[PDB]
Amino acid sequence: GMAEAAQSVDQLIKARGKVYFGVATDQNRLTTGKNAAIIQADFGMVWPENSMQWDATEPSQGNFNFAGADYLVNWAQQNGKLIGGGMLVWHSQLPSWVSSITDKNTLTNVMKNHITTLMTRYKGKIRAWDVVGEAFNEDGSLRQTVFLNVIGEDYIPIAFQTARAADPNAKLYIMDYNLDSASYPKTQAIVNRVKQWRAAGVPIDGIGSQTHLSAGQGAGVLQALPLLASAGTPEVSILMLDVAGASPTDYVNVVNACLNVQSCVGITVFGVADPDSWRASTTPLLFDGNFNPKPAYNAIVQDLQ
Ligand SMILES: O=[N+]([O-])c1ccc2nn[nH]c2c1
C-alpha cells in the first residue's frame, strides 16, 4: 500500500528495557496528514508542543484554557499512549500579565497556582511534567527570567515542591538545551546545580536534554548524557530531538546514548514529518514529507533489534 511496512521504535525500545519512544504533537497535527496513524503505529508517548504552555493555558490570571491540552490527553488515553506535559515554568511563552509582576509573594503564588492547576487537572494520568525549562544561561549561571529576577533562585525549589504535591505520581523534570556535549559549561553546571538542589531536598526526578543537533553532534551525546546522569536524578531523558540532515549515524548515536545510561527512560522526537518541523529546511525528523520512514528511522529499528 502507499503506507510502508515498518516496525515500531517504541515497541523495540521497550523490549530493550526503556519506557518509551515518544513524539511531540498537538491537535493541529493529529487531525492532518498521517500523523495520527504514524503515532499510533510507531510511538508510545506524546507531548504537547504548545497546548500546555503558559500562554495557551492561563492567558489571564486565574482563567485557564484546557481545550488543546484536554484534546491531547484524551487522544493519548484513547490511543493507549503515555502523556508528558509542560513546560510549567518557562520564560519563552509567558503571557505579559506574568512577566509584569514584580512582587515576590505574588509571583510565587502565581507560579504555584499555575503548576497546581495544570497538574491537578490530569492527576495520575501524566507520566512526567517538565516543571522548569531553559533555566540556565550558556555559561551555566541561571537565566535572568522574571522568575529568577523576582523570586530569586528559590523559584526552582518552590516549583518542584509544589508540583510534587499536585501529583505525587508524576516524574518531575528540569529541561534545557545545549546539554549535548560534555565540553560545554552548561552541561556541568546543570549537573552541579541539580546535585546541590537534590541535597537540598528538591524533588527533581529527571533532567531532560532538549536535543537539537546539527550533523555529527550525535557522538557528543554519548558523553553528555552519562554526565547528565551523574547528577543522581532517578531519570534522564532525551527530548525535543531533531537532527539536521537526519543522518542515521547521529540518530543511532543518540539512541545508543540512552541505551548506555541506565537512568535514561526514553527518547522523544520533536515531531513526525519533516515539513512540520521548526527546522524543516534541514529535514531533521524521522519521517519525510510523504510520511514515510527515512533511513534514520530504519537505522534506529536495526539498532534496537
Ligand atoms: O519531548 N518534547 O518534544 C517536548 C515538547 C514540548 C514540551 N513542552 N514541555 N515539555 C515538552 C517536551
Residue numbers in the entry: -2 to 302
Q: Which statements did the authors publish about this structure?
A:
Here, we investigate the molecular origins of the nearly billionfold rate enhancement achieved by directed evolution of the computationally designed Kemp eliminase HG3 (7). The Kemp elimination is a well-studied model for proton transfer from carbon that has served as a benchmark for de novo design. Although the first-generation HG3 design is significantly more efficient than an “off-the-shelf” catalyst like bovine serum albumin, its specific activity was further increased 200-fold over 17 rounds of mutagenesis and screening. All HG3 variants have an inactive conformational sub-state, rooted in the original protein scaffold, which was gradually supplanted with a catalytically competent sub-state as evolution progressed.
